[PDB]
Amino acid sequence: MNFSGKYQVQSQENFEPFMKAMGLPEDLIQKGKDIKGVSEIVHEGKKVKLTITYGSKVIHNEFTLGEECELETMTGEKVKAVVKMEGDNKMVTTFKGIKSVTEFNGDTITNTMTLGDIVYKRVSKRI
């Protein structure tokens, strides 16, 4: 599945509870509650490039399929994580103890983030 290009997030779930646990107050939560961003996915061989905008900040990371790859956060902390495709459509990468699932269906992507108890989802659709 080589369909590298940009994907702008449309739908998302559980943004509040994630940011809430992230230390975000309901008031700021309600404001951020409908923020997504523009993501870009370029898949080369095993490695797939992920550029994801969260509101103001943009994280650019590339990872190798079935291969241990280091995930670089918006903090600069980069950790070796092994990503291969779980969710059947796209790949899951566990890093910093957090479990991140991606599902790529045709032109749409379902991004499921898992932090301990808090689960987070985004759906990015082809632009």
Rounded CA-CA distance 124/24 in Å is 23
- Residue 44, C-beta contacts closer than 8 angstroms, at least 6 positions apart: 4
Domain map of the chain by residue range? 1-127
Binding residues for (9Z)-octadecenoate: 31, 39, 54-56, 122
- Evaluate whether 25 touches 127 at the Cβ level (below 8 Å): no
Binding residues: 31, 39, 54-56, 122
- Report the b/e string of 95-109 with b at 16+ CB within 10 A: beebbbbbbbeeeeb
Tell me if the domain spanning 1-127 has CATH number 2.40.160.40: no
Instruction: Give me the residue label for tokens 């992920």.
Output: 50
DSSP annotation string for 20-42: HHTT--HHHHHHHTT---EEEEE
- Residue 122, C-beta contacts closer than 8 angstroms, at least 6 positions apart: 9, 11, 12, 13, 36, 109, 110, 111, 113
Rounded CA-CA distance 45/2 in Å is 8
Experimental approach: NMR
- Evaluate whether 100 touches 92 at the Cβ level (below 8 Å): yes
Q: Which two three-digit tokens encode residue 88?
A: 């059947």
Rounded CA-CA distance 52/36 in Å is 9
